[PDB]
Design a binder for these strands. Structure first.
Ligand SMILES: CC(C)N1C[C@H](C)n2c(c(O)c3c(=O)n(Cc4ccc(F)cc4)nc(N(C)S(C)(=O)=O)c32)C1=O
Ligand SMILES: CC(C)N1C[C@H](C)n2c(c(O)c3c(=O)n(Cc4ccc(F)cc4)nc(N(C)S(C)(=O)=O)c32)C1=O
Ligand SMILES: [Mg+2]
Ligand SMILES: [Mg+2]
Ligand SMILES: [Mg+2]
Ligand SMILES: [Mg+2]
Ligand SMILES: [Mg+2]
Ligand SMILES: [Mg+2]
Ligand SMILES: [N+]
Ligand SMILES: [N+]
Ligand SMILES: [Zn+2]
Ligand SMILES: [Zn+2]
Lengths: 368, 184, 368, 184
DNA sequence: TGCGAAATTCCATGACA
DNA sequence: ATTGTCATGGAATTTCGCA
DNA sequence: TGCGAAATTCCATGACA
DNA sequence: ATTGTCATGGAATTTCGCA
């Protein structure tokens, strides 16, 4: 502080203060004559307070804060002291946006068999039809075969009624859902356990994770839309038609319909494929197993040039889910406990709970 | 001639009246000829209307080329015939008083009645809830004649509910004297 | 039709029917033995009806429609007949999504002088503060200097009251706004004409066009957020503070604050820049004019590999603005009258009105 | 000594009472020393409170290093002095009964009073609405001594409202006999 | 053994609250 | 304790029909 | 006439309803 | 008849301090 600045005035050399400039006293303040002009060198014990006043004017980041300070002051390594404060401003940390993209998505292996994994979700509220408001959508992970159920509410009891009808056909190993009330209720958990079904949940507010069923929702709404053009939106009676229509539609990349992947033979629907007419059912189920294992599988795309990847013990912040008006978009900083995979982490949250979370719903806390 | 396939022929039929379960009285029985797979639908009556309502559900999953039944009024109505024609399903009737299926179907329909009878004693009223597990049993039951269950033949994979406990399916001396009391 | 297919059966050659395959009669239907198997050749007069039935099952696009047809049929150039129908399906055309990106954005010249162009917009509803709900934001295009006005409603009368206070300082040549009710009212038009101000409107539902003020909104909300952390959202009293704070904040790319660009000298605010202390006001306004003309200007970025550009007379469709549930997202096809620039067009809309519209709110109608 | 600059000194002062306009009675007059730029604010009273409320608006646009005024009660209150200190503004008072500005400011303040007087006759009540156009006139009025208008000196550009019609600013014989009637 | 055109495959775009 | 997906229609590439 | 480190510049990211 | 913008903080590049 005053120690350093005294030595400096009597022409001694201090590290960080380049000797080639002339440092002097004026108005009771140490000054230096810099190419930009004459600037005040505040004592070290003064510097934190200057940075803070500078920063607080508008809660500016590195450069804009520096530029204010540089108007009046100079000292060695200012940005280091600037950054020091930015890393300590609770308000900046929880309000600012991230500027690093997530690592490239994973493309999980397609479930090997029909009934290995169901993806499920609600669509709605839709306009009332027969006093129904929602649709339960169930998509088999392997085939993309889909079941549609109209419900009055996205409730556990409606979900249970629906799945009882579906599970009459077969029981799935796993059902995957987002964390909607209907799926996280303990009533639903009992119902699953009763049947030896494992429940698997998406990281919260990250519907990409339920991408199989989400993507199918789109198709469902799309078809419903086309069918209802110029009519009132009476969709209840259409659900069966949509179900059948979609399950029997080709995916140009696969060259198969969901029904074909499920049954290995078209039922009596229009333009039924007749290629296996001469094979026995046994020869047919044989070609089917072969088809099932050789389906195209996409691979993880290139990283963006500014992606970030989670490391154990790193400070990260969770995105606030339904942020109120004028409230920060980010929770307080928290710590990465485990890296489940390059796109999913468990964090300890200052409360501190364990939370399993998508990297897309995180940012790495800036300035360490 | 071409080998027999799933969806080639559905065998349909009603079972009832039964003791009211959630205001249901009948069961519409659908069995795929080739795989022996069974679908069950609870109805309030053996009417054309209830048949149509039920098969509307099934045929939004798979459509048979041919449906076969006896000459039930429900199935011989011209309403049911319009319905089938709309959907491109040929209807096939067995001659009156002489029902014909196949060995496989006859046996399956036997099992269903036998299985139903077994579980509706002790709880003649809880059957509506039981339909799902009846179907799973029936469909994951091993076929003596073919090496496989209907599940396996329909989907070409093992099931996640193998019913290894091939039951008695017969009535215990408890259940015998209990079913003679519900009548008496 | 029956003509063509008769010639074909007796071994004659017809264009489009490769001679190397054996064509025959069976069940009263012309068949051909193709590497995929035996397919029926329907008479030309039958083909449109087949494509349509195929297509209607699920309103599928090219490949998925083709794959259904190919199950039963063959004829020369099927996809041509497939595409023919897709271009005629009103429902597909107005429901499907686009798969071509817009051409790269324009970066319009920065207005040359303060007061050449104002950009204006409302933010809100915000939580009530002193019974105020909205903010009128006014951004000078050249400087980025900003004026903030709290209003009870995004109304013309509130806008008029506000601009009367602002225009006391100076009158702008042009005011640019989006097409919010407040700005498009004829009361507002009178008010502008009275003062010789020209009103310039964004293409509808394309706030990028008001990007100067929009971007400033973000900053405004951001600062308000930071200031209100842990307090109730009493923002009314903060507007002045935010105004001053933002107008005096550096843009690291420019190295200037909006106030500096407006006045050429800092007023008495913290860390005021002192570099021109020895210049006369006249020398100062001279350096200012120089600064103003040499500010960094961004250039139009590279096109995406699948961008489309509007051509006069082309069928295009306007995006529906606030589409109802289960209703198409696109209006009926319309015609490009004039191409104002590579990113803006005038279309005649089937009604037919002239509409000036952003390319981002258009798609080129598929299959011509 | 360093050359004089905008925001170096604001000269403030009140004008009134005036005839009620939208329940306003006074005008707070702010003139930048160097540029001669004028800001006007209508108040309900020449109080510290109304001064603070008004200057709060101005100083959210630009803050003067020094404010100068006479010894009005409004300006000599310790409330106004706290306010200025918070904002880092030095307050400067002219000695009582002897107001001192500069040639430029004195002349500007003369114009303002003269201009106001001119337009409030015929419509002594419509002045609130007129403040904006008064300011534009004042600020786009050519300075004999310097080559430029306040607008030009403040912003370093020409204005979009050049007031080429340098008016009479004097009272017509109509306006003279009209202002002797509002009093009588 | 190479041509023009038709078929197929590729793949960025966008939307699933 | 978990993880994007896939219809779409121009463009790009490959294959076909014929020689 | 070249080194290590500090300063500056670059620039993808994301959000303005 | 009109048209994206620009704070942000790591990384990349350039400049500085010294020799
Ligand atoms: C309340 C319960 C837990 N819920 C919470 C979240 C709202 N959610 C669902 C849900 O079904 C969907 C969605 O279909 N989409 C649309 C979507 C967006 C991108 C994508 F890749 C796929 C789908 N977003 C959703 N959101 C999570 S967002 C991103 O809005 O926070 C949700 C829930 O059921
Ligand atoms: C009702 C009136 C005409 N209005 C209609 C539209 C809604 N709008 C405004 C408005 O102020 C804003 C926005 O600030 N943003 C946010 C934004 C999004 C992207 C971007 F680059 C900048 C800003 N979107 C808006 N929209 C146009 S969207 C894209 O939602 O249709 C609008 C209107 O005042
Ligand atoms: Mg959901
Ligand atoms: Mg969803
Ligand atoms: Mg019978
Ligand atoms: Mg707006
Ligand atoms: Mg806006
Ligand atoms: Mg006075
Ligand atoms: N996986
Ligand atoms: N431009
Ligand atoms: Zn901060
Ligand atoms: Zn269509």
């Amino acid at each position: 502080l005053d120690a350093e600045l005294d030595q400096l005035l009597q022409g001694h050399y201090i590290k960080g203060y380049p000797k080639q400039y002339t440092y002097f006293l004026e108005d009771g303040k140490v000054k230096v004559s810099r190419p930009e002009g004459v600037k005040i060198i505040p004592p070290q014990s003064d510097r934190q307070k200057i940075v803070l006043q500078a920063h607080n004017l508008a809660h500016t980041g590195r450069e804009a804060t520096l530029l204010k300070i540089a108007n009046l002051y100079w000292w060695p390594n200012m940005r280091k002291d600037v950054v020091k404060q930015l890393g300590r401003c609770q308000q900046c940390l929880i309000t600012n946006a991230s500027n690093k993209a997530s690592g490239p998505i994973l493309r999980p292996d397609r479930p090997q068999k029909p009934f290995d994994k169901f993806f499920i979700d609600y669509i709605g509220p839709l306009p009332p039809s027969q006093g129904y408001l929602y649709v339960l959508v169930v998509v088999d992970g392997m085939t993309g075969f889909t079941w549609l159920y109209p419900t009055k509410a996205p409730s556990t009891s409606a979900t249970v009624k629906s799945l009882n009808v579906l599970t009459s056909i077969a029981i799935p190993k796993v059902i995957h859902s987002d964390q909607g009330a209907a799926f996280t209720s303990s009533t639903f958990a009992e119902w699953a356990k009763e049947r030896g079904i494992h429940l698997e949940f998406s990281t919260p507010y990250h519907p990409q994770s339920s991408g199989k069923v989400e993507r199918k929702n789109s198709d469902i709404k799309r078809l419903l839309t086309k069918l209802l053009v110029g009519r009132p939106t009476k969709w209840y009676d259409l659900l069966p038609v949509v179900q059948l229509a979609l399950n029997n539609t080709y995916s140009p990349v696969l060259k198969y319909t969901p029904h074909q992947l499920l049954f290995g033979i078209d039922s009596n629907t229009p333009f039924a494929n007749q290629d296996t007419l001469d094979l026995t059912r046994e020869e047919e189920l044989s070609l089917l197993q072969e088809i099932r294992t050789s389906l195209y599988h996409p691979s993880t795309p290139p990283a963006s040039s500014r992606s970030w990847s989670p490391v154990v013990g790193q400070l990260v912040q969770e995105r606030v889910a339904r942020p109120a008006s004028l409230r920060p978009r980010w929770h307080k900083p928290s710590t990465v406990l485990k890296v489940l995979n390059p796109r999913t982490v468990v964090i300890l949250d200052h409360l501190g709970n364990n939370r399993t979370v998508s990297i897309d719903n995180l940012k790495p806390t800036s300035h360490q | 001639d071409r080998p027999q396939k799933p969806f080639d022929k559905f065998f349909i039929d009603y079972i009832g009246p039964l003791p009211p379960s959630q205001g249901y009285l009948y069961v519409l029985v659908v069995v795929d000829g080739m795989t022996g797979f069974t679908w069950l639908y609870p109805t309030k009556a053996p009417s054309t209307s209830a048949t149509v309502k039920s098969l509307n559900v099934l045929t939004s999953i798979a459509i048979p080329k041919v449906i076969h039944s006896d000459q039930g009024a429900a199935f011989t109505s011209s309403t049911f015939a319009e319905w089938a024609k709309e959907r491109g399903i040929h209807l096939e009737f067995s001659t009156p008083y002489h029902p014909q299926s196949s060995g496989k179907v006859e046996r399956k329909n036997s099992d269903i009645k036998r299985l139903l009878t077994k579980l509706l004693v002790g709880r003649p009223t809880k059957w509506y809830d039981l339909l799902p597990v009846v179907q799973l049993a029936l469909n994951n039951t091993y076929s003596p004649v073919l090496k496989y269950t209907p599940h396996q033949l329909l989907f070409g994979i093992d099931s996640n509910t193998p019913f290894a406990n091939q039951d008695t399916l017969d009535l215990t001396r408890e259940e015998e004297l209990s079913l003679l009391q519900e009548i008496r």
